């Protein structure tokens, strides 16, 4: 049974450098789960830099709704690069995917489906799930209005970073970045007419995506926070000299200013093995 306080605490204690995502997710998820008569399944699209917390947030959402999180019987993970790797097999993926979603929602109206690597998913396979996302009361005799769909993607990461870098160079705080700043920078790509058309409802004048959730590239200080957590998780005494040396081995961009981690947090943890026995 989801609590707003518990979801907020889990986000605040564990998710670093994502002030926009924390707030959007907290209010979108709590408001939907707490609504006994939703009009449409909650559809979230989480976009942004590699290694900055998209699967991590998904686990936080899942574990706050169901015991076991991603291992709950009611939470379903599709990894497009693992499960849907070959474009020419689209029909075989589509047929299995439609059966799987329909059977599980039949059995559990409050099912959760996560589509990871959506930017590598055949557009025709995305088309196959659009009816489940819409404002229909019944789709082939089953209501999807209590279900939740979460998409994870890198598309838009570079543009989102343009905003973060502009704020950094201007002497502004990261937490001053607003959703409107991100939506404006994405007007030419993720938010252009063809994408808006692609994601449009087939029933009323609305988008199938309820919330765009942007993820910002991580700074050096966020990488240090994650290294400290990994040290504790391994049972090490934290050593700030190792924190700095590990973080210094990571590649940062732009070439001149060294502001953001190329890989977010990814690959950092294997470097601890060169500093600990």
């Amino acid at each position, epitope marked *: 049974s989801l609590s707003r306080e518990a979801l907020q605490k889990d986000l605040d204690d564990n998710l670093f450098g994502q002030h926009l995502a924390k707030k959007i997710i907290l209010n979108a998820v709590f408001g939907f789960i707490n609504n006994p008569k939703p009009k449409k399944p909650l559809t979230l699209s989480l976009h942004g830099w590699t290694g900055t917390g998209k699967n991590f947030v998904s686990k936080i959402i899942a574990e706050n709704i169901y015991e076991g999180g991603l291992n709950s019987d009611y939470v379903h993970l599709f990894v497009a690069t693992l499960h849907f790797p070959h474009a020419s097999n689209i029909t*075989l993926y589509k047929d299995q995917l439609q059966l799987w979603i329909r059977g599980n929602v039949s059995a559990c109206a409050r099912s959760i489906f996560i589509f990871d690597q959506m930017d590598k998913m055949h557009a025709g396979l995305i088309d196959a799930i659009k009816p489940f996302l819409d404002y229909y009361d019944l789709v082939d005799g089953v209501s999807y209005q209590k279900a939740m769909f979460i998409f994870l993607s890198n598309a838009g990461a570079e543009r989102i970073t343009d905003v973060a870098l502009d704020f950094w160079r201007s002497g502004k705080q990261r937490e001053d970045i607003k959703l409107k700043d991100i939506e404006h920078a994405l007007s030419v790509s993720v938010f252009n007419n063809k994408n808006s058309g692609f994601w449009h409802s087939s029933l009323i004048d609305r988008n199938l995506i309820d919330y765009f959730v942007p993820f910002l590239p991580l700074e050096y200080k966020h990488l240090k926070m994650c290294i400290r957590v990994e040290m504790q998780s391994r049972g090490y005494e934290i050593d700030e000299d190792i924190v700095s040396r590990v973080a210094e081995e990571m590649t940062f961009f732009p070439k001149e200013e060294r502001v953001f981690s190329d890989k977010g947090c990814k690959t950092v943890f294997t470097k601890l093995d060169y500093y600990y026995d």
Partner: nanobody
Amino acid sequence: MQVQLVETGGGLVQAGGSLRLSCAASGNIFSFNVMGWYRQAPGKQRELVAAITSGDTTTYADSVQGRFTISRDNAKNAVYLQMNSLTPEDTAVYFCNARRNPINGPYYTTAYWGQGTQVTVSS
């Protein structure tokens, strides 16, 4: 239902000649992610020759490129291998293979194999 692959078409071919192998499956093959042909020559381990997805995308081992063509007929539950320009290097037992994979959960492959057909290419 017991689904089985049966290969036919093997035999002796003179060097430079051609041969067509067929595999009939006793059940529907639409849902096989990949079907293909492997070969096992004396004292050697089995190796990929050619493969094809359900949507007809093909690939070939380096040693047969340009000479062999794989094709698939989902409606007739059959896969074929046309072999041209054969040399004694192609002598082997040929096996048809089918692979089925899940769309959720941990990776695995359910594999099916036929009993194989002997191809001998004389010098």
